[PDB]
Design a protein around this nucleic acid. Structure first.
Ligand SMILES: *OCCCCCCNc1c(NCCOCCO[C@H]2O[C@H](CO)[C@@H](O)[C@H](O)[C@@H]2O)c(=O)c1=O
Ligand SMILES: *OCCCCCCNc1c(NCCOCCO[C@H]2O[C@H](CO)[C@@H](O)[C@H](O)[C@@H]2O)c(=O)c1=O
Ligand SMILES: O=c1c(NCCCCCCO)c(NCCOCCO[C@H]2O[C@H](CO)[C@@H](O)[C@H](O)[C@@H]2O)c1=O
Ligand SMILES: O=c1c(NCCCCCCO)c(NCCOCCO[C@H]2O[C@H](CO)[C@@H](O)[C@H](O)[C@@H]2O)c1=O
Ligand SMILES: [Ca+2]
Ligand SMILES: [Ca+2]
Ligand SMILES: [Ca+2]
Ligand SMILES: [Ca+2]
Ligand SMILES: [Mn+2]
Ligand SMILES: [Mn+2]
Ligand SMILES: [Mn+2]
Ligand SMILES: [Mn+2]
Lengths: 233, 233, 233, 233
DNA sequence: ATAT
DNA sequence: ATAT
DNA sequence: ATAT
DNA sequence: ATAT
């Protein structure tokens, strides 16, 4: 199977697989069962911002998820990603729906990685996604160009989201996530998202993830698996 | 054939194909016969710096090449790259040798591209090249990892450059070089290089280039063709 | 008197002092009488974007001004700023009103300057202005904090722009704009602005400027003098 | 007195004031008596790199100090700088000598601060310091321009360092270090340094510091006080 | 930019 | 490096 | 770039 | 929202 590190914005509690009984953000290390979660007051139909940060000095993966008129949710986990990820990775966004549904609309995405050894750097910023975006690998249901946005999961022409959908967007270039020689390795990711449901239970969520370079949507990974994992282990 | 725009650091005069009688820098638009050249005092065995700049406002491709404690060489050509290049490109470095030879050593390479529509940006910086550099596509004789450098052309075990060699390195991700709705599109590239010849007459040169995404070394493009062009037309 | 280089967004034709008979952008080198102008369709009450660029290779000061869903206005002038400005400068925004008036609201301002000798760089970005913004020098009627915006000219309690007003904001740190040993010197500025007039004939305009470090609003430089020049010579 | 937060590279143990019995790096919060220290193998006459990082999510001030052929030293302290520093600060480098001496040579210094609320940013980079550097406030013995370096303390023409010297360099612009509205505030500082002594005990060290905007070298603050503190409390 |  |  |  |  793939190697996954992710930050999940989990809109739907799957009590049976160890989610808390509320919408939550979490840190996923090689399992959909988050090593750490925080309660998240997801605002149906509002544009939110996710900020993800890590550096090889603190070795602490942290995320903040926020809306304009509101308190942030934040979650952190101490993990040495040198011991988890391969040296070279792809970075991506992933989203899914199951019996329940939501738009998994990405309005912007930026990423920066640095190896300060003589610094190697990578930075990309998408504030507009276009119809034939050749620096993105789209997987499953993911599409670009609709209002300059990335729709990770299936949405109708009138803006109605579909169930049993899964989709991912990976940056085309492999990323040098860690290097043994590096004295400082850091990365940060920012995305803006619009999660909207007619349902009283939106599902299932959006994740920022880092994977082996050849990562693909695992078979059946709609619903609670967020397009990331082959099972709930 | 491929579409090529390039800045050549041409160490060897091929007067036969319209090079001036001296080492020169030039702007190449779909031909090895430069639309503009400037005289270049290439310093055998010294580390030089090439700076390349373009924006959609002035539509002027400019380059400056320098060594510490010496006058720069500079060349500029008015060209609308929207009318020359496809919307999506790859960017790369290329070098060749023929009957005469030189190290075509790259010590660092950086690149930035920006579309201000809401700005999309791409930036990479290599100050160290590693043995298995997965964000580079190496073509022909190009290798990485030797002293943390990119050797565009074949260098022997004893450090001797070889004749009739050609090699290129392209950044793995396609680049959105122009867009109809962009109000400002800009790019810049910087690389540092070490050209050393144990004989007199070094040959043949190093180029920064922009190509169609699927660009490959034209067969036989050693010597005066700089790994860029299938012929000297 | 001060040394001024500016890009004017001139909303009011002063044909008396050589303005064209229409709202225009221009390049001002030590005179309010622009060395080059382009026609500008200023959109009353809309948020616009000004982009300004210069490098020591082309020695061409260029500006583009745009609104969403409209054609840009662009203006360029060949000028060696090494021969005009002192080595160290301050950069700023300036605006004025006279018998006629307009809001001269700035929503965002960014600036980057680079001397590649070993690169020295300065970059600031304001997307929000605060009430006590200690990295800005406010001159004349300029205020910050009103809706997180910079109001270059006086606006009444009921939001009405006032006549005979002039105001400027300079970045607190002096900027190394050129250096003899630099092989490449470059700068760019971006600002977003909202010009609104409740009457017809808005006046008088907004400028990005570069000045001697100790620059101050010339006394009486309201109206057509744009807070930049002591007279119309 | 001033408010100080600093990272000290402390070359000289002052056992009487709570230094450990070896050259150390430490985190100083409003006292020369470090809240946390780590052992530091200072390499007399070699160029080192100091990296300092903080963000408002982890609220952990961390530093790494390294030389090319060697293991790094790293030190971290959990501290909410919102509760320690004023909202607006200056950032600087400081160094001192006493009975014992060392060159306190700074070869490069960079700084970035961001308030992600709509992001406000500041970035400067000095790879060359010039004789009349108007974006630096030099205090005490500090001088620029000698080989493009910043000498924080007195050095003779032949490169011999003097005792009882103290000097600081502050960036001219005030820095917005924290903001109540900000969802993420981050900063990072990098400097390259050359500490060289003929003595077997070099003294006294180099600090990166953040202070009230009007910070000045306290009276008598040579030797163990590093130009930062009025006393050893 | 529209009016005398 | 010198003082207890 | 220097030699025939 | 339905199953125990
Ligand atoms: O400051 C400039 C120095 C002057 C150099 C003058 C040229 N010297 C020279 C020539 N001229 C004919 C060019 O072709 C000769 C060989 O061609 C092969 O080698 C070159 C270099 O690798 C390459 O560009 C060609 O494509 C081909 O591979 C001589 O014959 C001679 O000597
Ligand atoms: O699309 C452009 C619209 C056409 C405007 C034509 C001018 N209208 C106009 C003039 N012309 C003379 C200019 O001076 C009049 C008043 O001058 C004062 O006000 C302006 C604006 O604040 C300022 O630039 C001057 O410096 C002075 O303060 C009229 O008299 C009239 O109406
Ligand atoms: O806390 C838990 C609930 N409550 C939600 C039930 C809906 C209430 C509002 C409608 O009346 C559950 N339910 C059991 C989990 O299984 C739900 C169905 O699973 C599918 O759908 C979800 C959402 O798309 C996916 O996560 C899942 O993979 C399945 O496809 C709790 O545990
Ligand atoms: O661990 C401690 C030492 N050892 C160093 C003594 C020199 C050994 C090599 C020479 O033979 C000390 N010494 C006592 C501390 O006082 C030293 C003198 O203080 C002045 O000089 C230092 C260095 O510039 C300053 O820090 C201080 O402020 C005074 O100006 C230990 O505690
Ligand atoms: Ca879930
Ligand atoms: Ca040639
Ligand atoms: Ca005017
Ligand atoms: Ca000490
Ligand atoms: Mn979960
Ligand atoms: Mn040529
Ligand atoms: Mn004008
Ligand atoms: Mn100490």
């Amino acid at each position: 199977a793939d190697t996954i590190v992710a930050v999940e914005l989990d809109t739907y509690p799957n009590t049976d697989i160890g989610d808390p009984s509320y919408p939550h953000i979490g840190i996923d290390i090689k399992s959909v069962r988050s090593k750490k979660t925080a309660k998240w007051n997801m605002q149906n139909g509002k544009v939110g911002t996710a900020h993800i940060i890590y550096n090889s000095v603190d070795k602490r993966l942290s995320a903040v998820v926020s809306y304009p008129n509101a308190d942030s949710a934040t979650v952190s986990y101490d993990v040495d990603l040198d011991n988890v990820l391969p040296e070279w990775v792809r970075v991506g966004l992933s989203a899914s729906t199951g019996l329940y549904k939501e738009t998994n609309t990405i309005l912007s995405w930026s990423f920066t990685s640095k190896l300060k050894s003589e610094t190697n750097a990578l930075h990309f910023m998408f504030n507009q996604f276009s119809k034939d975006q050749k620096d993105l690998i789209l997987q499953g249901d993911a599409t670009t160009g609709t209002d300059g946005n990335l729709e990770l999961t299936r949405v109708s022409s009138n803006g109605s989201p579909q169930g049993s959908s899964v989709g991912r967007a990976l940056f085309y270039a492999p990323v040098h996530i860690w290097e043994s020689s590096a004295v400082v390795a850091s990365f940060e990711a920012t995305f803006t998202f619009l999660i909207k449901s007619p349902d009283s239970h939106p599902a299932d969520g959006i994740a920022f993830f880092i994977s082996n370079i050849d990562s693909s949507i695992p078979s059946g990974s709609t619903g609670r698996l967020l397009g990331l994992f082959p099972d709930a282990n």
